[PDB]
């Protein structure tokens, strides 16, 4: 009865101490080698040496920042049985804490209504007391297509939910369940399963047909405007000027399903957007949802999701309550974070979509310190933490009105410690005031977006939102269910991938320029542990490592074309530490994969994509950041123009290799020695740069073509012949 | 509005067959027509099997008069 | 490396025998340790070759 509902198991001591020792040894070796580089000059040409040593100093600092917060990685495992035994104990009303789920839809033209309907259905069919969940969908575009799609989904749910509940379905999402290659009778035992499943598949297909018909009808715009079924026109005719509008489906007022159990409430919201006021892309909609929930139904916790991300494991909220409801080890946790798992990814990782290294090494090893960093979607927040209050255990109305809104009802609804609604009770006042809460001038003389809710950053606001509450005394916690909790669709082509990395890098760059920067935010007052500060500094200054990187990518070839030296060579002293550095790095990688479980192939995919994406888009993001800062073309660039710096670098390195071959032709064994290191450096750069271009330009496996590569080699041979005949 | 308009090359498409269909009755009638096509395939396979064995005197038409194509290298013109 | 062409002859047969043994032994281990076709990985085999080269260099400097 007094057990904890979860336990934090440290990584096995035998499988972690060698890793720590190798890290310490690598630190010492790197320090000694850096001292050796600093002491020794070159005299012959100091510019290249200075550039190289500066690049290596920056690389060493980045390595320190990235690797230090990996001390004491942990894992967590939970006990749902005790939770159900102590809270869902039979004979009393259920006492599990309620939640609200937040789904934000931008525009159906890029997110098809079927994908959103899948997420809505997966949310509705969740395993959890029905009287304790509710879904809030924020339609930014105010379009009628999503409205009619939700009206269709609220009708199909009455059939989808009871069938899903009875037979315990694995994905609980229609399209991601009826498209499984695995056999669907592996462990089913009920006699009536086959007939009802074959009866429900047809209903799902008919629902798909209805959605496809709605899309086709909405594809053609009428002249005068859209028409609602009752008679009055749709208020969203002018996309840039429409009043606030909220509606409720499937609640207690709505009808029951097939068996008779009422569905979870599904409220559709659309905030007013008068022209002439600043509207925020995503933080504003989430803030409106948070403010509406306080008036409609107040819940201590809240989960958020993207349209493309559905719920795979049906007990994710029930598995987060073991962390958020324990008075012991959960009293000071501000949110629970799940890893982002993607569906439909190919066996080959064409452009690093799996993201194993991050979600498996960095965040798992960072869980030991105040929990991970808040990524985009798939995370359960505590309401009392978003309001700005510090964790517990260590006339007036005016300060509340400055802090958040001038709405008395919502202010009173926030003063309740856990759950509950203001004693108005009558639905008329609540449904007439929740439309007042989403006005266009609500967040004016208040603190919304600057200290409460979701921080009004620049492009990406998730990291600042998490860091604002980590800066206080709050903890967060990471969770890895055996059955993945949330699975989401993956980007289709590499152009979206490059746009995505550009957007993330630019968001980080702009974060590195405000008062919320992790480098010097709240140094006094503390409340934030130093290792978490280092992690945030890494997550902020990762793009800038691409500035020295370019130089270090070109410097070998630069010396290869003429000087062919970087440092004086001494085998007695420098060679031992030079080899020991690579040996320490290799041992570090081996011990990483010993306890992480990341495959070798994924490890090197991430390791090469480091440079590949750094030299392609991160220097660009730096150019936008510095250009915009100095200002006080600009929009997304073409996919092709992003990849010209790596191509230029590879071409220059290949030309340097050809020049080295020509010098070897001129060499008479007396100079056969020194050029080996330069060849090795250029070869390292080329091996890092080349495979991505191989994958891009070739649609076949192994080599792209045959005769074309052969003729490229032939042209290179003839070009070097012409260079030799005219030196 | 079917894309291939050929039965075997339509019912053997890996692509989803409800990508842009909007009519409410499409699914039931498609699943009713697939069975008819399979039955037609069975009938054709039966005809081939029956024709695989040559009779001694010659082929026989349904009406009564024999098939004029018994001698492959000598048969009158025939149109229907 | 120590040979000066005067001993370039006899070791060919020994190389052939060792190569026969290695060719018989290796592909099964390749299949076991690699889940991908052809070569298991890329950089790891490259670094194994690099480590072998540096080990033979250290052997040569200390014969
Ligand atoms: O453990 C791999 C780690 O490498 C980091 O850069 C290395 C790398 O050897 C090279 O860039 C430089 O010469 O040395 C540093 C020192 O570690 C890289 O920054 C990390 O992202 C990567 O995980
Ligand atoms: O995963 C979502 C999250 O990604 C962040 O970029 C990561 C990137 O995924 C990882 O591969 C690299 O090693 O580190 C960066 C820095 O965290 C991105 O910055 C976030 O905005 C985004 O929510």
Tab-separated table of N, CA and C in Angstrom, chain A residues 312-368:
chain	number	residue	atom	x	y	z
A	312	UNK	N	-0.450	5.567	-29.704
A	312	UNK	CA	-0.227	4.149	-29.959
A	312	UNK	C	-0.521	3.297	-28.729
A	313	UNK	N	0.146	3.578	-27.613
A	313	UNK	CA	-0.130	2.891	-26.358
A	313	UNK	C	-1.309	3.567	-25.672
A	314	UNK	N	-2.297	2.770	-25.279
A	314	UNK	CA	-3.563	3.292	-24.784
A	314	UNK	C	-3.522	3.681	-23.312
A	315	UNK	N	-2.389	3.493	-22.635
A	315	UNK	CA	-2.268	3.819	-21.219
A	315	UNK	C	-1.236	4.909	-20.956
A	316	UNK	N	-0.971	5.778	-21.935
A	316	UNK	CA	0.080	6.780	-21.774
A	316	UNK	C	-0.237	7.751	-20.644
A	317	UNK	N	-1.467	8.269	-20.602
A	317	UNK	CA	-1.855	9.147	-19.503
A	317	UNK	C	-1.878	8.389	-18.183
A	318	UNK	N	-2.391	7.158	-18.199
A	318	UNK	CA	-2.376	6.319	-17.009
A	318	UNK	C	-0.961	5.979	-16.569
A	319	UNK	N	-0.007	5.949	-17.499
A	319	UNK	CA	1.390	5.708	-17.171
A	319	UNK	C	2.119	6.975	-16.742
A	320	UNK	N	1.586	8.152	-17.067
A	320	UNK	CA	2.124	9.404	-16.552
A	320	UNK	C	1.554	9.783	-15.193
A	321	UNK	N	0.367	9.282	-14.849
A	321	UNK	CA	-0.186	9.573	-13.529
A	321	UNK	C	0.577	8.892	-12.404
A	322	UNK	N	1.231	7.759	-12.666
A	322	UNK	CA	2.077	7.174	-11.634
A	322	UNK	C	3.232	8.095	-11.269
A	323	UNK	N	3.624	8.989	-12.178
A	323	UNK	CA	4.655	9.979	-11.906
A	323	UNK	C	4.097	11.288	-11.371
A	324	UNK	N	2.942	11.727	-11.868
A	324	UNK	CA	2.392	13.026	-11.500
A	324	UNK	C	1.454	12.988	-10.302
A	325	UNK	N	1.122	11.812	-9.779
A	325	UNK	CA	0.160	11.726	-8.690
A	325	UNK	C	0.745	11.194	-7.393
A	326	UNK	N	1.963	10.671	-7.418
A	326	UNK	CA	2.635	10.284	-6.183
A	326	UNK	C	2.978	11.523	-5.370
A	327	UNK	N	2.512	11.638	-4.126
A	327	UNK	CA	2.952	12.762	-3.286
A	327	UNK	C	4.433	12.723	-2.960
A	328	UNK	N	5.081	11.565	-3.087
A	328	UNK	CA	6.477	11.432	-2.675
A	328	UNK	C	7.427	11.945	-3.755
A	329	UNK	N	7.615	11.163	-4.818
A	329	UNK	CA	8.584	11.487	-5.858
A	329	UNK	C	7.939	12.208	-7.036
A	330	UNK	N	6.726	12.726	-6.865
A	330	UNK	CA	6.054	13.426	-7.942
A	330	UNK	C	5.527	14.788	-7.540
A	331	UNK	N	5.758	15.174	-6.285
A	331	UNK	CA	5.282	16.457	-5.785
A	331	UNK	C	5.975	17.645	-6.437
A	332	UNK	N	7.179	17.458	-6.979
A	332	UNK	CA	7.962	18.560	-7.523
A	332	UNK	C	8.280	18.386	-9.002
A	333	UNK	N	7.506	17.586	-9.726
A	333	UNK	CA	7.718	17.379	-11.152
A	333	UNK	C	6.767	18.282	-11.925
A	334	UNK	N	7.296	18.983	-12.928
A	334	UNK	CA	6.497	19.925	-13.700
A	334	UNK	C	5.943	19.346	-14.995
A	335	UNK	N	6.635	18.406	-15.639
A	335	UNK	CA	6.039	17.731	-16.785
A	335	UNK	C	6.695	16.376	-17.006
A	336	UNK	N	5.981	15.535	-17.754
A	336	UNK	CA	6.434	14.209	-18.158
A	336	UNK	C	6.591	14.213	-19.672
A	337	UNK	N	7.746	13.759	-20.151
A	337	UNK	CA	8.087	13.832	-21.565
A	337	UNK	C	8.328	12.436	-22.127
A	338	UNK	N	7.728	12.165	-23.282
A	338	UNK	CA	7.875	10.928	-24.030
A	338	UNK	C	8.738	11.153	-25.267
A	339	UNK	N	9.451	10.129	-25.730
A	339	UNK	CA	10.266	10.284	-26.937
A	339	UNK	C	9.393	10.308	-28.177
A	340	UNK	N	9.895	10.978	-29.211
A	340	UNK	CA	9.181	11.064	-30.479
A	340	UNK	C	9.517	9.847	-31.331
A	341	UNK	N	8.547	8.956	-31.498
A	341	UNK	CA	8.689	7.809	-32.380
A	341	UNK	C	7.925	8.079	-33.667
A	342	UNK	N	8.524	7.699	-34.785
A	342	UNK	CA	7.965	7.937	-36.105
A	342	UNK	C	7.616	6.625	-36.791
A	343	UNK	N	6.609	6.693	-37.664
A	343	UNK	CA	6.085	5.536	-38.378
A	343	UNK	C	6.346	5.677	-39.873
A	344	UNK	N	6.460	4.535	-40.550
A	344	UNK	CA	6.695	4.537	-41.979
A	344	UNK	C	8.123	4.795	-42.399
A	345	UNK	N	9.066	4.833	-41.457
A	345	UNK	CA	10.461	5.049	-41.815
A	345	UNK	C	11.014	3.809	-42.505
A	346	UNK	N	11.871	4.030	-43.497
A	346	UNK	CA	12.486	2.935	-44.228
A	346	UNK	C	13.545	2.248	-43.369
A	347	UNK	N	13.894	1.020	-43.762
A	347	UNK	CA	14.963	0.303	-43.077
A	347	UNK	C	16.280	1.062	-43.183
A	348	UNK	N	16.586	1.588	-44.365
A	348	UNK	CA	17.723	2.482	-44.523
A	348	UNK	C	17.336	3.891	-44.095
A	349	UNK	N	18.205	4.524	-43.312
A	349	UNK	CA	17.981	5.898	-42.870
A	349	UNK	C	18.630	6.820	-43.896
A	350	UNK	N	17.814	7.350	-44.810
A	350	UNK	CA	18.348	8.149	-45.908
A	350	UNK	C	18.954	9.457	-45.408
A	351	UNK	N	18.321	10.096	-44.431
A	351	UNK	CA	18.754	11.409	-43.964
A	351	UNK	C	18.439	11.598	-42.478
A	352	UNK	N	18.736	10.575	-41.676
A	352	UNK	CA	18.710	10.664	-40.214
A	352	UNK	C	17.343	11.110	-39.693
A	353	UNK	N	16.317	10.316	-40.002
A	353	UNK	CA	14.979	10.591	-39.493
A	353	UNK	C	14.692	9.893	-38.172
A	354	UNK	N	15.466	8.867	-37.819
A	354	UNK	CA	15.136	8.073	-36.640
A	354	UNK	C	15.492	8.813	-35.356
A	355	UNK	N	16.555	9.622	-35.387
A	355	UNK	CA	16.987	10.425	-34.240
A	355	UNK	C	17.277	9.560	-33.015
A	356	UNK	N	18.027	8.471	-33.207
A	356	UNK	CA	18.311	7.563	-32.098
A	356	UNK	C	19.200	8.217	-31.051
A	357	UNK	N	20.248	8.920	-31.487
A	357	UNK	CA	21.266	9.400	-30.554
A	357	UNK	C	20.652	10.347	-29.532
A	358	UNK	N	19.855	11.305	-29.997
A	358	UNK	CA	19.222	12.269	-29.107
A	358	UNK	C	18.344	11.570	-28.077
A	359	UNK	N	17.214	11.020	-28.529
A	359	UNK	CA	16.197	10.460	-27.648
A	359	UNK	C	16.668	9.238	-26.870
A	360	UNK	N	17.789	8.628	-27.246
A	360	UNK	CA	18.268	7.420	-26.586
A	360	UNK	C	19.473	7.648	-25.689
A	361	UNK	N	20.378	8.555	-26.054
A	361	UNK	CA	21.576	8.805	-25.268
A	361	UNK	C	21.407	10.100	-24.488
A	362	UNK	N	21.179	11.204	-25.206
A	362	UNK	CA	21.256	12.518	-24.579
A	362	UNK	C	20.170	12.699	-23.529
A	363	UNK	N	18.917	12.434	-23.893
A	363	UNK	CA	17.816	12.707	-22.976
A	363	UNK	C	17.730	11.645	-21.885
A	364	UNK	N	18.036	10.385	-22.219
A	364	UNK	CA	18.083	9.350	-21.191
A	364	UNK	C	19.165	9.632	-20.158
A	365	UNK	N	20.347	10.066	-20.596
A	365	UNK	CA	21.395	10.420	-19.661
A	365	UNK	C	21.219	11.758	-18.989
A	366	UNK	N	20.359	12.610	-19.536
A	366	UNK	CA	20.050	13.898	-18.941
A	366	UNK	C	18.870	13.813	-17.982
A	367	UNK	N	18.129	12.703	-18.009
A	367	UNK	CA	17.035	12.487	-17.067
A	367	UNK	C	17.488	12.566	-15.615
A	368	UNK	N	18.752	12.254	-15.327
A	368	UNK	CA	19.238	12.332	-13.961
A	368	UNK	C	19.305	13.740	-13.409
